[PDB]
Amino acid sequence: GSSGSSGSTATQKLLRTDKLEVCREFQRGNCARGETDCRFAHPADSTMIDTSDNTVTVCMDYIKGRCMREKCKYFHPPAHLQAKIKAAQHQANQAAVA
Ligand SMILES: [Zn+2]
Ligand SMILES: [Zn+2]
């Protein structure tokens, strides 16, 4: 076979929704809005963080309201947030801009 047509651009082609951008301030302890008034998730453990993208996985089950996965090892976002994501899946209208 070809075994590699071409690698001009080094980047995959896909998109996920279970990815929360970890805050930069909180990490050091500067964020005042907190995971509550802050859109970015605040990892308390700060262990499942990738220094490559700086994003944490999102528990799909939990989002639905029932999280009983096997040894759930994903971040659990707050209520306000949990929704922000849900809406995305369920076709709906968007609010104005800030
Ligand atoms: Zn924050
Ligand atoms: Zn979970």
Q: Which amino acid is at 53?
A: D
Q: Which ligand is nearest to the CA of 70?
A: 2
The angle subtended at Cα 45 by Cα 40 and Cα 46, nearest 5°, is 60
Tokens describing residue 13: 């082609």
The angle subtended at Cα 45 by Cα 68 and Cα 55, nearest 5°, is 80
Q: Domain-by-domain residue ranges, the chain? A: 1-98
Contact indicator for 41, 35 with CB cutoff of 8 Å:
yes
* Exp. method: NMR
User: CB neighbours (10 Å) of residue 65?
Assistant: 8
Q: Which ligand is nearest to the CA of 26?
A: 1
Distance CA 47, CA 41 (A): 13
- What distance in angstroms lies between residue 5's CA and the mean position of ligand 2's atoms? 40
Distance CA 86, CA 24 (A): 24
Is the CATH number of domain 1-98 3.30.1370.210?
yes
Task: Using the Cα atoms of residue 60, residue 66, residue 71 and residue 74 in order, give the sign of their dihedral.
Answer: positive
* Residue closest to 24 by CA, chosen among 4, 42, 1: 42
Q: Which ligand is nearest to the CA of 34?
A: 1
- What distance in angstroms lies between residue 34's CA and the mean position of ligand 1's atoms? 5
- What distance in angstroms lies between residue 56's CA and the mean position of ligand 2's atoms? 13
